Design a binder for this molecule. Structure first.
Ligand SMILES: COc1cc(/C=C(\C#N)C(=O)Nc2nnc(Br)s2)ccc1O
Length: 328
């Protein structure tokens, strides 16, 4: 059977927290007043929610309202508990209130309003300095939630809100997030295809916070190389082949051999043999202003097959890539 795995950091955060901290099924929601919020316009719809801009008529301030779609009360209470546990943490979206929507018959989560700059306008404009600055801001959120025993499991551009005017960033949509318990097997059907870590794509269930660091590396690669998404697979099998054409097949076999994983035999006709590539091959005249030796070394240390070998969030914040970023 598969070789077990543990996070190399924050391994026992939840074992030493009180049970109420991670036992989200027993959480008792404290409901606010549903008429406090006047919906203004629909911002978006996803598979699990619809999001609206609203006015909190009690303090005359803008908020956003996330009306959850019908899903098992455990995933709803899981998200609520995680948001309450993380509230006040650096660059974590702030849950302001929870109300019962009378039409959907589900909870509506009320969040702080972030004046989000257009995500397409954003990445086409980000300077080298901006990319380093916002990556550091994302790392603050990830180190915080990891230090709190939680993995996000859905890091991707759509879940990073940036108000570029005020240089303000928030990590949102904690609906896939989970508590990390050593030895626990987790669902591999998490994250968007282009950001799925190798552990998900080879069906290795005993993963940890380091999943988020692969996803972060995929975002970084897309930003500094101006290729969206970077690993552009047609399905979850082709996604791993795309990764293997860059990281190479010998290190993929080393990875699965370390954990006693076998590839789906359907890979026999599609995977091939591939050398590991050097990151410089992706540099060209239209992205070179975003690339530096430090950027490539940082990216290289995030994008490892072996989840145990990736930089942790705190280690990433120590990387020379961020030396140029002005610290508060
Ligand atoms: C989907 O899950 C979440 C979403 C949000 C927030 C937004 C969304 N979508 C949002 O504020 N979008 C905006 N677009 N323009 C402006 Br101006 S604000 C907050 C917490 C969540 O868990």
């Amino acid at each position: 059977g598969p070789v077990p795995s543990r996070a190399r950091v924050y391994t026992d955060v939840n074992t030493h927290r009180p049970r109420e901290y991670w036992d989200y099924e027993s959480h008792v929601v404290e409901w606010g007043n549903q008429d406090d919020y006047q919906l203004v316009r629909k911002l978006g719809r996803g598979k699990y929610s619809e999001v609206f801009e609203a006015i909190n008529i009690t303090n005359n301030e803008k908020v956003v309202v996330k009306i959850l779609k019908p899903v098992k009360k455990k995933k709803i209470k899981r998200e609520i508990k995680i948001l309450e546990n993380l509230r006040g943490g650096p660059n974590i979206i702030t849950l302001a209130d929870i109300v019962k929507d009378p039409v959907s018959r589900t909870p509506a989560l009320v969040f702080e309003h972030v004046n989000n700059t257009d995500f397409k306008q954003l990445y086409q404009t980000l300077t080298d300095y901006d990319i380093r600055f916002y990556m550091y801001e994302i790392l603050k959120a990830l180190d915080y939630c990891h230090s709190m025993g939680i993995m996000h499991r859905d890091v991707k551009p759509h879940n990073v809100m940036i108000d570029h005017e005020h240089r303000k960033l928030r990590l949102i949509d904690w609906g896939l997030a989970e508590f990390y318990h050593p030895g626990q097997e987790y669902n591999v059907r998490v994250a968007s295809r282009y950001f799925k870590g190798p552990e998900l794509l080879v069906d290795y269930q005993m993963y940890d916070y380091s999943l988020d660091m692969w996803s972060l590396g995929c975002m970084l690669a897309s930003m500094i190389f101006r290729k969206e998404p970077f690993f552009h697979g047609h399905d979850n099998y082709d996604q791993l082949v795309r990764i293997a054409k860059v990281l190479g097949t010998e290190d993929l076999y080393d990875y699965i051999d370390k954990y006693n994983i076998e590839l789906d035999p359907r890979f026999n006709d599609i995977l091939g043999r591939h050398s590991r590539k050097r990151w410089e091959r992706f540099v060209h005249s239209e992205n070179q202003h975003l690339v530096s030796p430090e950027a490539l070394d940082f990216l290289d240390k995030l994008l490892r097959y072996d989840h145990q070998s990736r930089l942790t969030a705190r280690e990433a914040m120590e990387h020379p890539y961020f030396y140029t970023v002005v610290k508060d």
